[PDB]
Every structure is written in structure tokens, then in C-alpha cells.
Amino acid sequence: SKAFDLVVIGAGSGGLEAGWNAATLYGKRVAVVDVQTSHGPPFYAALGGTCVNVGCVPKKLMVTGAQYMDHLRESAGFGWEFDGSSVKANWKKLIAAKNEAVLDINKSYEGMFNDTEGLDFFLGWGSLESKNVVVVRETADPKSAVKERLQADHILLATGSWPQMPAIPGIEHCISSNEAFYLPEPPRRVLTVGGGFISVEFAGIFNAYKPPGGKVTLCYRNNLILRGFDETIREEVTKQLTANGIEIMTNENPAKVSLNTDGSKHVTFESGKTLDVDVVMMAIGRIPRTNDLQLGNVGVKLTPKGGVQVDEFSRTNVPNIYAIGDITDRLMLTPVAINEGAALVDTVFGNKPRKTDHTRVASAVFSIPPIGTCGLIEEVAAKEFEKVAVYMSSFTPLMHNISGSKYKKFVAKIVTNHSDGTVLGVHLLGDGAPEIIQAVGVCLRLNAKISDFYNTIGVHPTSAEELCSMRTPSYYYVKGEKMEKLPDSN
Amino acid sequence: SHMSKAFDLVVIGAGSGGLEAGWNAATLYGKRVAVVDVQTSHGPPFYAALGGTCVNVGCVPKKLMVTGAQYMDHLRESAGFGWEFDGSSVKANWKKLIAAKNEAVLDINKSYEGMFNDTEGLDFFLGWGSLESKNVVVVRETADPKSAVKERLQADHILLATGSWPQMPAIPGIEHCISSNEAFYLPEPPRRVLTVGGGFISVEFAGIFNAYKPPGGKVTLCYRNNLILRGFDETIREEVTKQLTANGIEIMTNENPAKVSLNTDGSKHVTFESGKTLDVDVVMMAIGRIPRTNDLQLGNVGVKLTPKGGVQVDEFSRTNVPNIYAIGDITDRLMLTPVAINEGAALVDTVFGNKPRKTDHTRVASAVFSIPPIGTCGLIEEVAAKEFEKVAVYMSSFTPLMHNISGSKYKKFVAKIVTNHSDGTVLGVHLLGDGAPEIIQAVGVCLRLNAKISDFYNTIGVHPTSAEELCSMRTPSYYYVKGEKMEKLPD
Numbered sequence: 014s015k016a017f018d019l020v021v022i023g024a025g026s027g028g029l030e031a032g033w034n035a036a037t038l039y040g041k042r043v044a045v046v047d048v049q050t051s052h053g054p055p056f057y058a059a060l061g062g063t064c065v066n067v068g069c070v071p072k073k074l075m076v077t078g079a080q081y082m083d084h085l086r087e088s089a090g091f092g093w094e095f096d097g098s099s100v101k102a103n104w105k106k107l108i109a110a111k112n113e114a115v116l117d118i119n120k121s122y123e124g125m126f127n128d129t130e131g132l133d134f135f136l137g138w139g140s141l142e143s144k145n146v147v148v149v150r151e152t153a154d155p156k157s158a159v160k161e162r163l164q165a166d167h168i169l170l171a172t173g174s175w176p177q178m179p180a181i182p183g184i185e186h187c188i189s190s191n192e193a194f195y196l197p198e199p200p201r202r203v204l205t206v207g208g209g210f211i212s213v214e215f216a217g218i219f220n221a222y223k224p225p226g227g228k229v230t231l232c233y234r235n236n237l238i239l240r241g242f243d244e245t246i247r248e249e250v251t252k253q254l255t256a257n258g259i260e261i262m263t264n265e266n267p268a269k270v271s272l273n274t275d276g277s278k279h280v281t282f283e284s285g286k287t288l289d290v291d292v293v294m295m296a297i298g299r300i301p302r303t304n305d306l307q308l309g310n311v312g313v314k315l316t317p318k319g320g321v322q323v324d325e326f327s328r329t330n331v332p333n334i335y336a337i338g339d340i341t342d343r344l345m346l347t348p349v350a351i352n353e354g355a356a357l358v359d360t361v362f363g364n365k366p367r368k369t370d371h372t373r374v375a376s377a378v379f380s381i382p383p384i385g386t387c388g389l390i391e392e393v394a395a396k397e398f399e400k401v402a403v404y405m406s407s408f409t410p411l412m413h414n415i416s417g418s419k420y421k422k423f424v425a426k427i428v429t430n431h432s433d434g435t436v437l438g439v440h441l442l443g444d445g446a447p448e449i450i451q452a453v454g455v456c457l458r459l460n461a462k463i464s465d466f467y468n469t470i471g472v473h474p475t476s477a478e479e480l481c482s483m484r485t486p487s488y489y490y491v492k493g494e495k496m497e498k499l500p501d502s503n
Numbered sequence: 504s505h506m507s508k509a510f511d512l513v514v515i516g517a518g519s520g521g522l523e524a525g526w527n528a529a530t531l532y533g534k535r536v537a538v539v540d541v542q543t544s545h546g547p548p549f550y551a552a553l554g555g556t557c558v559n560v561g562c563v564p565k566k567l568m569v570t571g572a573q574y575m576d577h578l579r580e581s582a583g584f585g586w587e588f589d590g591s592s593v594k595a596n597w598k599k600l601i602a603a604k605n606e607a608v609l610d611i612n613k614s615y616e617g618m619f620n621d622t623e624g625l626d627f628f629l630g631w632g633s634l635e636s637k638n639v640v641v642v643r644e645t646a647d648p649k650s651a652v653k654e655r656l657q658a659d660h661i662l663l664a665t666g667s668w669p670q671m672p673a674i675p676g677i678e679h680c681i682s683s684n685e686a687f688y689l690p691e692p693p694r695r696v697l698t699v700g701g702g703f704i705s706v707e708f709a710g711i712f713n714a715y716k717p718p719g720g721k722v723t724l725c726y727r728n729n730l731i732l733r734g735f736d737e738t739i740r741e742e743v744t745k746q747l748t749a750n751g752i753e754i755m756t757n758e759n760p761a762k763v764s765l766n767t768d769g770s771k772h773v774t775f776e777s778g779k780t781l782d783v784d785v786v787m788m789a790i791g792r793i794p795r796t797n798d799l800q801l802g803n804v805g806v807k808l809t810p811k812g813g814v815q816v817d818e819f820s821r822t823n824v825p826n827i828y829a830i831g832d833i834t835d836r837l838m839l840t841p842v843a844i845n846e847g848a849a850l851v852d853t854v855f856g857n858k859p860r861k862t863d864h865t866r867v868a869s870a871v872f873s874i875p876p877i878g879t880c881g882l883i884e885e886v887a888a889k890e891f892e893k894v895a896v897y898m899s900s901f902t903p904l905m906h907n908i909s910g911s912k913y914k915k916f917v918a919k920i921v922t923n924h925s926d927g928t929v930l931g932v933h934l935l936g937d938g939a940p941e942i943i944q945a946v947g948v949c950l951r952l953n954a955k956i957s958d959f960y961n962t963i964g965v966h967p968t969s970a971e972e973l974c975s976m977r978t979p980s981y982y983y984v985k986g987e988k989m990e991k992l993p994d
């Protein structure tokens with residue numbers, strides 16, 4: 014029956030940021046609930062969230078590992094000699110090293126709870142019993158035994174999202190990214206299903222660690238993966254993945270998966286094509302985890318798509334009840350959940366209300382090679398603006414003149430409103446893209462124009478200087494129509 | 504008896520600035536342009552050539568070599584991510600690095616030749632350019648002003664763009680020492696090398712020699728004062744010192760060669776001013792570069808020099824002599840390739856375009872391709888604190904994600920923002936760590952737009968990256984109030 018200013022359900026990026034800020038910035042008394050104290054099966058997420066446990070952090074460590082496939086090969090062009098027949102990619106070591114670093118992070122979030130006054134952690138399954146009462150139970154089952162009942166002036170829902178699995182016969186023989194982080198052996202043959210972040214990122218991880226003779230296949234339901242990203246870059250990353258041995262199967266989708274007696278899976282596509290692989294990893298979206306919160310108990314409204322409905326300020330239709338992060342289905346990124354939670358605490362317990370700006374958010378795909386993007390792609394720009402200019406550069410980076418990776422083109426594109434030169438979006442493909450694009454995120458907060466980029470003096474030699482070397486559009490959109498040249502003087 | 508070839512513009516020096524000027528004058532302004540340089544491809548005897556220091560013996564081959572050098576770390580760091588391979592078979596083949604670099608530089612030389620052959624109104628002259636009088640450039644067989652005149656060119660306008668050259672101290676035995684020029688052509692990697700100087704070139708090459716040295720090798724860098732890389736952020740100077748050490752380079756501070764003798768085995772015996780001594784296979788002087796003014800015969804026309812030996816120019820790159828201009832390293836303003844380019848483009852716009860324009864030498868982003876690299880743009884805190892009553896410093900120093908597993912725990916990434924605390928305006932940003940050169944580029948655009956610390960903070964991080972740390976700091980680590988460093992503003 015313990016009372017708190019704030020009760021947070023979900024010890025993830027959004028929930029921890031809100032919880033820590035309320036206790037430390039504002040002197041509030043804070044309870045935070047989550048289902049597990051460190052990573053891995055059975056509940057996968059845990060203290061620190063999807064980011065720490067089965068998301069940004071282990072994914073980034075494992076893509077970093079996969080990049081060495083390239084490094085070891087490209088080294089030879091710079092006079093490095095070693096016994097190439099002795100190279101092996103040890104997946105068990107990768108996974109163990111990742112486990113240990115993730116476990117360190119979990120214990121350091123445990124450390125934070127223990128060392129911070131008015132910030133308490135409760136292990137279990139939180140749901141809403143009423144307006145001001147969060148119940149903590151033993152399991153996801155609402156009929157399981159009660160562990161605690163926390164009362165709450167304010168309740169924050171930050172339970173994140175969960176892999177979506179299509180309802181096909183045999184889906185129980187497939188995995189999601191959760192299980193991918195713990196496979197005991199790397200698959201010899203693997204199908205990644207989906208053309209978005211997770212499928213592309215993991216396709217590159219499995220590509221580097223595959224045993225001899227192995228093959229990664231990614232399949233996508235439509236023509237061209239990475240819908241929503243810059244189109245030249247969709248095409249170019251498709252090519253660069255293909256050049257590193259990944260087969261991109263377009264216009265295909267599994268209809269049925271069968272278990273072979275030897276443990277492999279027999280996939281039938283809606284087309285009637287079939288393929289045998291060791292692992293089928295489903296990466297077709299993540300959905301809000303609303304189901305276990307018993308939201309009917311208090312009437313918190315959901316969106317048609319299943320997200321907790323919130324206003325600009327993260328408020329539900331129930332006063333004193335809030336939702337942030339992936340549970341809201343708005344932008345599913347760690348940094349945004351964070352900014353959301355920090356803005357919610359500042360609003361509830363602070364001076365002035367704050368809302369998170371979901372426009373011009375810079376983000377990245379840690380594919381090999383990686384993507385960095387901030388702002389509008391050109392087909393979206395072309396519907397909002399009469400005149401759009403596109404500046405485009407695509408070049409072999411300096412080192413890939415001699416590394417042997419001739420296929421590794423860097424792509425830089427800037428999209429403007431051509432009527433005033435205002436930059437609307439920047440899109441980058443190639444090593445460094447995630448790092449380069451960060452400060453570009455800042456430039457878009459400052460009403461940057463194309464001439465603000467081209468009049469800035471280059472840093473040489475970098476890939477990034479190409480962003481500041483583009484003066485003349487490559488093509489335009491006028492009234493929605495793509496054209497090499499402007500028709501008229503206006 | 505017969506007419507000289509006549510140009511709107513004669514450029515002496517086919518390097519970063521002079522080519523940008525020449526190409527722009529010919530192609531944007533329809534001018535008839537001559538550009539003179541002493542060699543058509545890289546290497547001894549003259550080292551720079553068509554394409555400049557940049558292409559031949561600077562930015563381009565340097566960066567290819569530092570990129571080579573980084574595989575020493577990659578090969579070692581890959582173990583932590585489960586890569587396995589026979590450690591005892593690894594060998595760094597310098598001769599192959601150099602041959603690969605040579606071919607890449609030669610293809611760039613060749614593409615510049617083709618640029619001349621293909622662009623009408625743009626001509627190349629091989630030889631040594633000097634000013635015979637105020638509208639006459641002569642192209643001679645050698646740097647000796649008494650050598651035969653190959654061509655006498657009529658010039659309405661004359662651009663001086665001959666760059667800089669390594670400075671060598673007047674010590675006994677200086678003839679046994681090399682500069683960065685010879686470093687690019689060493690037939691074998693040196694076992695033991697002293698790099699003299701604590702600036703860009705000593706530090707970049709120390710990491711190159713470090714990766715490629717044969718077994719039992721040692722790279723020593725000496726610097727004359729207490730802390731290398733003066734003019735850079737102090738936290739960074741100290742952190743880069745620690746990281747060079749941690750990678751096996753030995754840093755001798757407060758030391759300076761007084762003389763060098765040849766040992767009987769061909770090695771060098773260096774004696775320092777302090778009376779200390781060191782034997783090495785190569786002594787590489789990297790103690791600065793000075794403007795290359797001597798061969799131009801500037802006395803023929805009265806072009807004035809600064810007290811420091813740069814050609815003196817106004818803000819638009821004009822000398823005291825009408826129709827004679829100077830851009831790039833020979834002006835001694837900022838010695839960087841994109842600066843020289845920006846000056847050449849600005850100068851041509853001013854002279855042939857309709858559009859008077861000057862280069863802004865403040866807030867220029869630049870990088871040191873050390874291992875780990877540095878990226879920086881704008882003012883260091885101690886400079887800021889002399890011109891602003893209240894400066895805030897925002898500092899973050901952290902072990903990047905990957906180095907919790909790579910084995911390279913010494914690899915801290917440092918990110919610093921220097922502000923005018925009275926309105927939040929960012930004065931300088933200083934980065935140390937992999938990716939810094941790449942990150943800083945768009946930061947350069949940020950300062951051009953007068954970003955404040957709040958615009959950085961308000962911007963949503965890209966996660967996980969090093970860069971996002973720049974967008975995650977809201978609270979000064981400390982301040983300068985009237986020049987005085989202190990943790991807390993006086994209440």
C-alpha cells in the first residue's frame with residue numbers, strides 16, 4: 014500500500030529517463046516496475062529496456078563485429094599479409110562478449126536504483142487496477158498472485174513494443190530478433206523476412222558469421238526494400254548488400270513454414286516458390302505492448318493500430334495517466350522515447366510544459382553499409398512544395414580505390430525547397446553516415462539553406478565534405494513532376 | 504620577331520588553390536588561363552606536381568597511409584568480437600602500401616592532365632615560373648633564375664599559388680634528416696624513427712610508422728615544449744598524448760635535436776640540446792612549413808612579404824602590385840587544402856566575376872588524422888575566455904560502446920562545446936576519437952548558423968553513436984568568468 018508521486022510501468026528508455034528525472038531533478042518519490050532484472054530469455058527485455066537488452070546496444074556491438082569480415086579482406090590492399098585460410102568468425106564468442114557487456118549495463122542500472130533515494134524498483138508484471146493503483150503480479154496472467162499494490166498520484170505507461178508475427182501456418186517454427194540475439198550457432202542458411210531496419214541489420218550480421226558455404230536470404234513483399242527511405246539509397250544499399258553475398262529476394266512473402274525432421278524449415282512463398290533454411294527470422298514490424306496492462310480496468314483509449322492514444326504532451330484520455338515511447342507507436346527510436354519521457358516529467362512536475370518534436374529527427378540504419386537520414390525524402394517534399402531541388406553526389410570513397418571494395422559507393426543527397434533554398438532533408442549512405450548526420454539534425458533546427466552548406470569550408474579528405482561541395486541541383490520536382498532541368502525562369 | 508602566348512590569367516602553382524582558380528576562371532568566366540608547375544606527376548626530384556601538395560605529398564597519400572595504419576588496430580580489436588586467425592602470420596608490408604599509394608596518386612595526376620587536354624582556354628606549362636615584370640611570367644628549365652627560358656608568357660593578371668615547403672632547422676648534420684617529402688618514398692619502413700615536432704605532420708606520421716615498423720621497432724616523437732599540439736584543445740592534447748603512448752609511440756617532451764651524425768652502420772646519432780642522445784634509422788623533421796616565395800623572383804616587381812615571409816595580401820588576396828594576387832599556403836593564413844581552394848574560388852569571383860568576395864578564415868572545421876583522430880571547429884576555451892566575459896565549457900569523455908569489448912579501453916572519445924555563456928552561442932567544438940573528422944564537418948555548418956548550446960541539446964540524438972554525445976549535454980562542466988576558470992558561477 015506504499016504511495017508514490019510517480020509510478021512507471023516499464024524500466025526502458027522512456028521509463029527510466031522519466032523516473033530518474035522525477036527523483037533527481039524534482040525530489041519526487043518514484044516506483045519503476047519491470048519483469049526481469051537482466052537480459053535474455055524468458056522475457057528478453059529487462060532493466061534498461063529493449064535498447065540495452067535486445068536492441069540498440071547488442072545490435073550495434075554485433076554489427077561492429079560483422080564489419081571485421083570487410084576489414085580483414087580490405088586490409089590486404091594496404092599491404093597487410095596473414096594466413097587467410099586460418100580466418101574463422103566465432104559466433105559463440107561474439108554472443109558471450111555481447112552478453113557480458115549487456116549484463117554490465119543491467120547491473121549498473123541496478124546500481125542506479127540502489128544509490129538513488131526516492132527511486133525504487135519492483136520486479137513483476139504491472140497493470141492498472143484503478144486510476145491511482147498500479148498492481149504488480151507474478152506473471153502476465155491477471156489471475157496470478159499479487160506482489161505489490163502501488164498507489165500513484167501519476168502513472169506512466171512505458172512498456173514499449175514487441176515483434177509482430179504474421180498468422181501463417183507454421184509461424185511457431187520462426188523466430189524474431191529476440192531469439193536471434195541468443196542463437197547457439199550461427200545459421201548456415203537464414204531467411205530474414207521484411208525489408209525494414211531489423212531485417213536489413215540482421216541480414217548483415219548473419220552474413221559475416223555464417224559458416225563456410227552458408228547463405229543469407231532477405232525477402233521483401235514489394236519491389237524495393239526500405240520503403241520510406243531515400244530511393245537512390247534504397248537502390249544502392251540493395252546493390253551493396255548483393256555485392257557482399259546477401260541474396261535480396263523481392264516481391265516474395267512466406268505463406269507457410271514446415272518443420273523438416275532434421276530441424277531445418279521448409280518455406281513456401283505466396284508465389285509457390287520454396288526455400289530450405291536453418292532459421293526463419295521474422296522482422297515485419299513491432300507493435301505496442303498494451304495487452305498486459307489491463308487497460309479496460311480504467312478505460313485508457315487505444316488507436317485503431319493498437320497504440321495508446323496520447324495528445325502532443327503524452328496525456329491519455331485519463332487524467333494522471335500518461336504514455337511515452339514505443340507504446341505510443343509514434344516514432345519507435347530510443348532517443349525519442351527518452352525526449353518524450355523527459356518532456357513529460359518537465360510538464361507534470363515542473364515550471365513549463367514541454368512537448369517532443371517528432372519532425373526532422375535524425376536516425377540511422379546500421380546496415381553494412383550504413384544509412385544516415387534526417388528530414389523529408391524527395392517524393393514527400395514534392396507534394397508539399399511546388400519547387401524541390403535535389404542535390405546528389407555518389408562517389409568511391411578515397412580508401413576504396415585500393416581496398417578492393419570497388420562496389421562501395423558513398424551517396425550524399427540534399428533535398429530543398431528550391432523557392433528559398435531551405436534544406437528539407439539530407440540522406441546518406443556509406444561508412445560514417447550515422448555519425449555525419451547527427452549535426453545535420455542540428456542544422457535543420459536552424460532554418461539551414463543549401464548555401465549554408467556549400468559556403469561552409471570542407472574538411473579534407475572525408476566523405477562528409479561532399480555535403481558542402483554541392484552547388485548545382487542534379488534535378489528538380491516542379492508541381493510533383495521529376496525533371497532534369499527547370500522549364501521556365503518562374 | 505614573334506608574339507608570346509597571351510592569357511587573361513597566369514597561375515604559378517598547379518595545386519589546390521591554383522587549380523580551383525584556373526578551372527573556375529576558364530570554365531565559369533570564359534578566360535584564357537595558363538597554369539605552371541614543375542612536374543606533371545608525383546615524386547622525386549620535386550615531390551609536388553600537377554595537383555599540388557594535396558594530391559602528391561599531403562592529404563591524399565597521407566590519408567591512404569593512415570587508413571593502412573588503422574588495420575593494426577582492427578586486426579587486434581577483431582579478436583574481441585570473435586574473429587580468429589593465426590596471429591603469428593600477420594605482417595605489414597610497407598613496399599606494397601607505397602606501390603598502392605603511388606598508383607592511386609599517379610591516376611589522379613593523369614586525370615588532371617586530361618582535365619587540361621579537355622578544357623579549352625585552360626593550358627598547362629611545365630617548368631619553373633617567376634615574375635620577370637608586372638605582366639610577364641617566364642617559365643624556366645630549373646629553379647635557378649639563370650637557367651634557360653622555356654616560355655615567356657604575357658599575363659593580364661598573375662596568381663601566386665606555389666604553396667609551402669618543409670622548414671629544416673640549421674643544425675650540424677641536417678643533411679642526414681628527411682622531411683615528409685622523403686617519408687612518402689622510403690624504400691623500407693624504418694625500424695627506429697624520430698619524428699621531430701609536435702604538430703600535424705609529426706603526429707600523423709608517428710602513427711603511420713608505428714603500424715608499419717618491422718619487429719623490435721620503436722617510433723619516437725620529440726617535441727620542444729611540455730605538451731604536443733599547441734593551438735588545440737588542452738583536454739584533447741593530453742588525451743591524444745596518452746593514446747599515442749598506449750599504442751607504443753614514445754613521446755619525448757621538452758626535447759629538441761641540436762645535431763645529428765652518421766653512425767658507421769648508416770644509422771643516425773641524434774644529440775638533443777639537453778645532451779641526451781638517441782640512435783634511429785630515420786630522423787623526420789616536421790617542425791613547420793614555410794611559404795615558397797624564393798623561386799618567384801618577387802624583387803623584380805616589388806611584391807611585399809609579411810615579417811614572417813608570407814606574401815602580404817588584403818582580405819581579397821590582393822598583393823601591393825595591381826593585377827598580382829596570392830592565395831593558399833604562400834599567404835601563411837590557414838594552411839589547409841579547402842582553405843586554399845576557397846581562396847582561389849573567391850579571388851577569381853572578385854577579379855573576373857561580378858562579385859567581390861573574401862574567404863572567412865574563422866570557424867573553419869579541420870581534422871588531425873592521428874590515431875585516434877581529432878576534429879575541431881572554432882575557438883579553444885582559453886582563447887574564448889580572453890574575449891568573452893563569461894564562457895561555459897560542456898565536456899563529455901567516455902569509452903565508446905565497441906571498446907567495452909575490443910580490448911582497447913584506453914580509447915576514450917572526448918567531446919567539448921565551448922560557449923559564450925551570456926547568450927549560449929557556440930564558439931568552438933573539439934572532438935577526439937574515431938569518426939571525429941566526419942562528425943565535425945556538419946558542426947562547421949552549425950557554427951556558420953550561430954547555433955547555441957540549446958540547439959544542440961534540443962536536437963534528438965542518433966543512437967548508438969559517438970556524435971549523439973554533442974546533443975546530450977545541457978549543464979556546463981565549468982566556466983571562465985573574466986578569464987578565471989571555475990566550476991561554478993559565482994552566486
Ligand SMILES: Cc1cc2nc3c(=O)[nH]c(=O)nc-3n(C[C@H](O)[C@H](O)[C@H](O)COP(=O)(O)OP(=O)(O)OC[C@H]3O[C@@H](n4cnc5c(N)ncnc54)[C@H](O)[C@@H]3O)c2cc1C
Pocket residue numbers: 022023024025026027028046047048049056058059060061062063064067068069070072137138139140171172173174190211302305306337338339340344345346347348350966967
Ligand atoms: C532489434 C532492435 C534494434 C534496435 N536498434 C535501435 C537503434 O539502433 N537506435 C534506436 O534509436 N532504436 C533502436 N531500436 C528501437 C528502440 O529499442 C526502442 O524504440 C526503445 O527501446 C523504446 O523504449 P521504450 O521506453 O518505449 O520501451 P522499452 O525500451 O521496450 O522498455 C519497455 C520495458 O517495459 C517492460 N514491460 C513490458 N510490459 C510490462 C509490464 N506489464 N510490467 C512491467 N514491465 C513491462 C519490458 O520488459 C521493457 O523492459 C531497436 C529495436 C530493436 C527490436
Ligand SMILES: Cc1cc2nc3c(=O)[nH]c(=O)nc-3n(C[C@H](O)[C@H](O)[C@H](O)COP(=O)(O)OP(=O)(O)OC[C@H]3O[C@@H](n4cnc5c(N)ncnc54)[C@H](O)[C@@H]3O)c2cc1C
Pocket residue numbers: 473474515516517518519520521539540541542549551552553554555556557560561562563565566630631632633664665666667683704795798799830831832833837838839840841843872
Ligand atoms: C604531409 C602533409 C599532409 C597534409 N594533409 C592535409 C589534410 O589532410 N587536410 C588538409 O586540408 N591539408 C593537408 N595538408 C596541407 C595542404 O596540403 C595544403 O594546405 C595545400 O596543398 C595548399 O594548397 P596550395 O595551392 O597553397 O599549394 P600546393 O598544393 O602546395 O601547390 C603549390 C604547387 O606549386 C608548385 N610550384 C612551387 N613553386 C613553383 C614555381 N616557382 N613554378 C611553378 N610551380 C611551382 C609546387 O610544385 C606545387 O604543386 C597537408 C600537407 C602536408 C605536407
Ligand SMILES: NC(=O)C1=CN([C@@H]2O[C@H](COP(=O)(O)OP(=O)(O)OC[C@H]3O[C@@H](n4cnc5c(N)ncnc54)[C@H](OP(=O)(O)O)[C@@H]3O)[C@@H](O)[C@H]2O)C=CC1
Pocket residue numbers: 179206207208209210211212214233234235239240266296297298299344345346376377378379
Ligand atoms: N537503427 C535503428 O534506429 C533501429 C530502429 N528500430 C525500430 O523498430 C521499428 C520496427 O523494426 P522492423 O521490424 O524492421 O519494422 P519496420 O517497420 O522498419 O519494417 C517492417 C518490414 O516488414 C514489412 N511488413 C510489414 N507488414 C508485413 C506483413 N504483414 N507481411 C510481410 N511483411 C510485412 C514492411 O514492408 P512495407 O514497407 O511493405 O510495409 C517492412 O519492409 C523500426 O521501424 C524502428 O523504428 C529497429 C531496428 C533498428
Ligand SMILES: NC(=O)C1=CN([C@@H]2O[C@H](COP(=O)(O)OP(=O)(O)OC[C@H]3O[C@@H](n4cnc5c(N)ncnc54)[C@H](OP(=O)(O)O)[C@@H]3O)[C@@H](O)[C@H]2O)C=CC1
Pocket residue numbers: 672699700701702703704705707726727728732733759789790791792837838839869870871872
Ligand atoms: N590533417 C591536416 O589538416 C594536416 C594539415 N597540415 C598543414 O600544414 C601545416 C604544417 O604542418 P607541420 O610541419 O606539422 O607544422 P605545425 O606548425 O603544425 O607544427 C610544427 C611543430 O614543430 C614545432 N616547431 C616550430 N618551430 C620549431 C623549431 N625551430 N624547432 C623545433 N620545433 C619547432 C612547433 O612547436 P610550437 O608549439 O613550439 O610552435 C610544432 O610542434 C600544418 O600546420 C597544417 O596547416 C599538415 C598535415 C596534416
Ligand SMILES: N[C@@H](CCC(=O)N[C@@H](CS)C(=O)NCC(=O)NCCCCNCCCNC(=O)CNC(=O)[C@H](CS)NC(=O)CC[C@H](N)C(=O)O)C(=O)O
Pocket residue numbers: 025026027029030031033061062064065069070118347348351901902903904905964966967968969971972975
Ligand atoms: N543520453 C545518453 C545516451 C545513452 C543512452 O541512450 N542510454 C539509453 C540506454 S542504452 C537510455 O535509455 N538512456 C535513458 C536513461 O537511462 N535515463 C536515466 C538516466 C538519465 C541520465 N543519466 C545520464 C545520461 C547521459 N549519459 C549516459 O546515459 C551514459 N551512457 C549510457 O547510458 C549508454 C549506456 S548503453 N552508453 C552509450 O550509449 C555509449 C556512448 C555512445 N552513445 C556510444 O554509442 O559509444 C548520452 O548521450 O549521454
Ligand SMILES: N[C@@H](CCC(=O)N[C@@H](CS)C(=O)NCC(=O)NCCCCNCCCNC(=O)CNC(=O)[C@H](CS)NC(=O)CC[C@H](N)C(=O)O)C(=O)O
Pocket residue numbers: 408409410411412471473474475476478479482518519520522523524526554555557558562563611840841844
Ligand atoms: N569536394 C571534393 C574535394 C577534392 C579536393 O579537395 N581535391 C584537391 C586535391 S587532393 C584539390 O586541390 N582540388 C582543387 C581542384 O582540383 N580544383 C579544380 C577542379 C575542381 C572542379 N571540379 C569539381 C569536381 C570535384 N571533385 C573532385 O575534385 C574529385 N575528387 C578527388 O579526386 C578527391 C581526391 S583529389 N577525392 C576525394 O576527395 C574522395 C572523396 C572524399 N573527399 C573522400 O575523401 O573520400 C571531394 O570531396 O572530392
